[PDB]
Amino acid sequence: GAMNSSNYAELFNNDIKLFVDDTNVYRVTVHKTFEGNVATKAINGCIFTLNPKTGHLFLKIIHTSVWAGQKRLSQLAKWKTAEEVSALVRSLPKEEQPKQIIVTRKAMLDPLEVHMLDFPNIAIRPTELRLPFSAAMSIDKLSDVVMKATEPQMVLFNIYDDWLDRISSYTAFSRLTLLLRALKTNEESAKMILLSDPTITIKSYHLWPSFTDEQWITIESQMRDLILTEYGRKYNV
Amino acid sequence: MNTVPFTSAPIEVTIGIDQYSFNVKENQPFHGIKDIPIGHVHVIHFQHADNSSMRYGYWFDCRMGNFYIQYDPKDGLYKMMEERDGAKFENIVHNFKERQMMVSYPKIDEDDTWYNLTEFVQMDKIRKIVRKDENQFSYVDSSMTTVQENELSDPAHSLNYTVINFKSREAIRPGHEMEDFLDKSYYLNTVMLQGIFKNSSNYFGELQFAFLNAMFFGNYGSSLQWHAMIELICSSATVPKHMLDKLDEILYYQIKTLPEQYSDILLNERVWNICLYSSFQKNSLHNTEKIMENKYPELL
């Protein structure tokens, strides 16, 4: 059933699993028409499909051309997500296919279940976790490859960079969700925290800066502070 | 006008015959039901006074043989049996009629209720859903599970309704996932109507039979099947116009006949709300929407 705080360590066991977040698939700017009506203009989106154990990110870029002449796009976006995840699973060798796919939004369950009927042994699960994967597009290098895409494209990343050389996948996921939660709550502040010291760079082959173990502790502290402040404001507490 | 004689009534029992019902006392000189209309299936059903658990009964058609009921003190139920000796049977019935020990099937001349509930129901189709080929009549009870319920355990005692499953390869053409899930017309028209049922009469017959088993026996798997067959039509954008008009009549008489006090367990809120207010056919079931809104506005 649902993935929650109770069964959190299951994410880091040896059963291949993927999270699927569809938040950034169908993206629009809302604007006024010449006649003073409102219209949307789609921008490039992406499916965020993540192995939480390995950090392998399957970023399927959703080019605006897929929406051309389609109706009910927020509904279609769920089915297109399910089609592309199904296509991704079929493209993987059998021993790399997930045993479970966890959807961050319950509205993805029926679309993904129907697209995955051919895989009755792959469990499609919701989660009770409020995961901040919507903030993926606050990671400059992921934002850049999505916006520059001129056609449908899959791009492969390791969202943990080289962290697993030094930390467990539990700790790596906790760092990722903290960074993304910060980026989601106050993007400007979070990005300031991550780059403020110009001597710490992002390797060409990485997404995040090359922090030492000690610098990560400071960074992680600064992100927790950001999240608590913002929370006090949101709620006046 | 056919007759189902009873050998005796050794245990106190509520006896149903179609939509009618009579209380019989322990060892009351009750010897059966006469004036049963020819031309329809019928169901004779029982609920013992001492165990209001296990409603059970027999679907039959008096055109297919001479049937009687006899209590079996070993198995503890009223059993339907066929009398193969025409002259013995005629002589049994004539005697019981002469002694007026039979209740008369109490049909009002104006009243088309039973026709309206069984319009498409055939004994030959009942006998394929309820498999006991040595008998011309079919036993159903409260507890019998469906083939679909058994998949999710004694196959001989199952209700072999047509399996309907909206998230199955049968229901969903590869490459038409979203189309087939949101619009079940493919599944209704090609797979179920053309493929399995052959025509809408057979589809309606199974739908009507499922309802009657749900209503008369509180058979939960039957209620699931009735709702699934309603939902498969209402969730199809493309349904023949005669089918929608006929469905509206079928459901109207079903909702009209349902005991008011059983709406809570026999009607699925989600299915009815979806069918009358959200589905492609939200505006195609005028009679049904009107009786549902006036009789069960709470459910909606």
From Swiss-Prot, chain A:
Changing D21A: Alters protein folding. Severely impaired growth. Strongly reduced growth at 35 degrees Celsius. Changing D21N: Reduced growth at 30 degrees Celsius. Strongly reduced growth at 16 degrees Celsius. It is found in: Nucleus. Residues 7-237 are annotated as: RNase H homology domain. The MPN (JAB/Mov34) domain has structural similarity with deubiquitinating enzymes, but lacks the residues that would bind the catalytic metal ion. Functions as a scaffold that mediates the ordered assembly of spliceosomal proteins and snRNAs. Required for association of BRR2 with the spliceosomal U5 snRNP, and the subsequent assembly of the U4/U6-U5 tri-snRNP complex. Functions as a scaffold that positions spliceosomal U2, U5 and U6 snRNAs at splice sites on pre-mRNA substrates, so that splicing can occur. Interacts with both the 5' and the 3' splice site, as well as the branch region. Has a role in branch site-3' splice site selection. Associates with the branch site-3' splice 3'-exon region. Also has a role in cell cycle. Component of the U4/U6-U5 tri-snRNP complex composed of the U4, U6 and U5 snRNAs and at least PRP3, PRP4, PRP6, PRP8, PRP18, PRP31, PRP38, SNU13, SNU23, SNU66, SNU114, SPP381, SMB1, SMD1, SMD2, SMD3, SMX2, SMX3, LSM2, LSM3, LSM4, LSM5, LSM6, LSM7, LSM8, BRR2 and DIB1. This is Pre-mRNA-splicing factor 8. It comes from Saccharomyces cerevisiae (strain ATCC 204508 / S288c) (Baker's yeast). The chain holds residues 1836 to 2069 of 2413 of the full protein.
Swiss-Prot record, chain B:
GO terms for cellular component: cytoplasm; U5 snRNP. GO terms for biological process: spliceosomal snRNP assembly; spliceosomal tri-snRNP complex assembly. Keywords: Cytoplasm, mRNA processing, mRNA splicing, Nucleus, Phosphoprotein. The modification Phosphoserine is found at S236. The keyword Phosphoprotein applies. CDD domains: Aar2_C (cd13778), Aar2_N (cd13777). Heterodimer. Interacts with PRP8 (via RNase H homology domain and MPN domain), competing with BRR2 for the same binding site. Component of a U5 snRNP complex that contains at least the U5 snRNA, PRP8, SNU114, AAR2, SMB1, SMD1, SMD2, SMD3, SME1, SMX2 and SMX3, but is not a component of the U4/U6-U5 tri-snRNP complex. Belongs to the AAR2 family. This is A1 cistron-splicing factor AAR2.
